[PDB]
Symmetry: D3
Subunit: 151 residues, 6 copies
């Protein structure tokens, strides 16, 4: 079903450092989304280079990979109706001056470069990102959506 | 240092089910403890059996394994000074009738059998539980404590 | 006065089931609105049929009445300046994909059909709905607005 | 079953006045207890008198009725296992100087006389209070406990 | 730096009376702004007259000064990137019917005249207002921004 | 009246640092206590020395002054009935291992030395601390208690 849609959400090293892991997870929880993947990791540069490949050229890339490599990240896969579209809305617009109070970036980050959180911008982008961060065994299902989430 | 003590907290299937994961995590972060391991898994019978092996002959064993296997759980290693003893106080005492408001069990569970959460009861149980539930490459430490451990 | 305006808010069976009654009431409370009616009820089909009469024809009607009949609802009357207009804003837009973080539907529901909450869309609609759900004795006043709330 | 025990909680006029209704409700929901009765009323003298009838000869009787009548209150029946005993712990002990942070009185009231909230002290007081404050058609049960009661 | 920008925020007597001081401060805190001034005061009429000088003529002025004089105010100076622009956003639009859920006025005030909170609308206006409410000694710095905040 | 008792709470540099000021304030407001003094300052050595003068010969004196001076703190006078005794309960006992979840230390500090917060331990310490940290024109009272004090 469409209610088997999945999105990738990462909490970057400053989100963790500022003790926001509980608060962020809790927001998805009370929305009514289902957790299907959760993992705490030190991301390899390889992974980060691949993740940020579309920007492998721009000047900021090096320091950006460095930031993400610099601390633990929380990797998450959340499941539910329009979870990609709604998920971006819950995060707020990427720019931390356009982010409205009540969204995550809205209530919580100021710095545009070294922010708190990432979200998939499309269903395609999510599948790509879930592939990259998660092995298929680390995705637990029990929502009988696993048999529908094929592409 | 003594500030490198680690303890293991599990959120049992009901806790995940009831949507209490973030809340539970929030309490530990805001107390000041360091997250050094966090995963979402379906516990295997082989793991659950090894984990509860001191109870393997009690009559409720099979059903307790069946409970813990029945849904995904969240496993966690937290770090800090007296994090084991302190973590036991934050959950509240094992029996959710003796549990006090302000603790996790106090605020959140009613049933004694299927309850919300588990925490290590000793540094030794912690070492054992931790190694049982996490491969050592799964741990993430940056706190310059990893060496001490 | 205009500050004797009243609106009807219902928490539907899933709002109750998901343990959101405290959180929803508390939002009106801290806004500075006054509670003048609160009641926990199993709605009769008659009541629900009358409530949803404008849609007594559309296909979804039957299952919609069924949902509302299927569990306890919390009925509320809140009082205060522009409480109808502001009340809809606090709920968010009815569609759970347009609902912004920080509103009730925003933070809390995903499913468009079986949602969490209802609010009056007009002062007329409120009077109609308050009539329907509440007996005049179940409206407690102590805000000296009872003598002004005549239409 | 024992999981069909009901208890009565009232939020006295100050509690409503101070905007604490939702918060108070939130604590019971999140503990896991079932709401099976909830109304907003002006308590009558005739009801308040019958309710506090064990105190009808103490010197403060009249004024205590006058307090409870002076503003609308929120009445509630909650359901669950040990909900009476457990509900007493969540409010904190009757005297708001012995009350502990994390309990409702602890977090919210200062004055001993006019305080925030009332809870039943026994299954018997609960049955009595409940029937006194609610007609039985006012209760809403779906939890397949209604029969047990 | 631009990250030494400062804004003035006042909590008016009703914000205090309604016990909202913790909640308001906490919102700036979790945003990631730095407190550089905080003071609890009974404002002189002189101060208030000067503050509200641009409206020293309009009819509402007298009662408006009276309100602000009528109770304790909390005066605050917060520091950080775009703290003036972001600060207004965190407050919500000044009119309490346009204020969106999730902002401070949004979640918390209804009355347009006697509201909860004030925020600077510009960097100029902030400097003016900080001058007026704060002596330079009451501004504590420890963010090494004091040496940059010159105009 | 007895409802005019004042007590002094300081938030030490770590508390401000960790972003806990609002939260801490929220607890006192929501309990019902009146804010009658609130400032954000760098404490001087001369003040900190006078404040901790009963400890001036212990070996940790110098370093404790250095801690309290190392960053800005938030000073507060709160008003109400038993606000000193009650305020001590809300913080939790001085040693953050005996502290209970639901109290401020319980929920928020781990380290015993550098901790989050201070509260007066007696009406007399309160009077002394208050006058030490606040000039009397800095206090704001409207509660018709100012006279009583």
């Amino acid at each position: 079903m469409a209610n088997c849609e999945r999105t990738f959400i990462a909490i970057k090293p400053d989100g963790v450092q500022r003790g926001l892991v509980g608060e962020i997870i809790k927001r998805f929880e009370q929305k009514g989304f289902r957790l299907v993947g959760l993992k705490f990791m030190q991301a390899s540069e390889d992974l980060l280079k691949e993740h940020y490949v579309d920007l492998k050229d721009r000047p900021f890339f090096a320091g950006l990979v460095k930031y993400m490599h610099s601390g633990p990240v929380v990797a998450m896969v959340w499941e539910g109706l329009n979870v990609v579209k709604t998920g971006r809305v819950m995060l707020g617009e990427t720019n931390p001056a356009d982010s409205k109070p009540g969204t995550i970036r809205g209530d919580f980050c100021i710095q545009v470069g070294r922010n708190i959180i990432h979200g998939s911008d499309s269903v395609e982008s999510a599948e790509k990102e879930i592939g990259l961060w998660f092995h298929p065994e680390e995705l637990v299902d029990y929502t009988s959506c696993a048999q529908n989430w094929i592409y």
